[PDB]
């Protein structure tokens, strides 16, 4: 048919990630300082929270100094938790760790004329180009009803300038499942369990 959708109708739905591992690689190569797993273990073991389990897996991957374990975390473990286990706080982790936190680093370090002025537009543009991530967000919002995942799409469409889609995801935010309504799961909040575990941040602490 004329719509190219029809040319791929019924085909493989698989979306391959194109993630930038350059900061995780760099951290593994140069970091000499122990990274504390105590907080992640507290959330995984003491509190029983799967977001802490994911944080601990990320940190253990870095400890291993095997980049392949970092790749496994983002490409296998994350989708296994987001999709297969219906754990909505996994769904935005690659976006945060490998896009949001990368662009943040460019703002902090005055790289390539990136500023707070361009950041929100820049992040929306970069996230919208990462189809693997967009599809995990759509799942975490539309299927799992996580208002924080809905908010990720709301923000993306807002700074793309798509008013209809911004409204759509704003409305979906108001209808979230209470199981996901904790600042533990809000990447913008200090209480975020997974906060500070991007290598784009960890590189700042090498000191």
TrEMBL record:
Disulfide bonds join 44-53, 82-91, 141-150. Keywords: Plasmid, Signal. It comes from the Bacteria. This is Secreted protein 1. The lineage of its organism: Bacteria, Pseudomonadati, Campylobacterota, Epsilonproteobacteria, Campylobacterales.
């Amino acid at each position: 048919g004329i719509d190219p959708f029809t040319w791929g109708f019924g085909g493989s739905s698989k979306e391959k990630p194109n993630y930038d591992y350059s900061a995780d690689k760099k951290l593994i190569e140069i970091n000499t300082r122990p990274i504390s797993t105590d907080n992640a273990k507290y959330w995984c073991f003491d509190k029983g929270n799967d977001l802490g389990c994911l944080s601990l897996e990320k940190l253990e991957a870095l400890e291993s100094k095997d980049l392949k374990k970092v790749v496994k975390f983002y490409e296998k473990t994350i989708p296994e938790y987001c999709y297969d286990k219906k754990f909505a706080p996994a769904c935005n982790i690659p976006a945060i760790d490998l896009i949001q936190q990368k662009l943040s680093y460019y703002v902090r370090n005055d790289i390539d004329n990136k500023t707070i002025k361009t950041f929100y537009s820049d992040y929306a543009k970069a996230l919208s180009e990462s189809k693997a991530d967009v599809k995990m967000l759509e799942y975490g919002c539309n299927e799992l009803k996580s208002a924080y995942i809905c908010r990720d799409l709301r923000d993306m469409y807002k700074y793309l300038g798509d008013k209809e889609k911004t409204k759509e995801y704003n409305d979906k935010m108001k209808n979230g499942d209470e199981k996901w309504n904790s600042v533990l799961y809000d990447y913008k909040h200090m209480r975020y369990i997974h906060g500070g575990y991007s290598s784009w941040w960890l590189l700042e602490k090498i000191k």
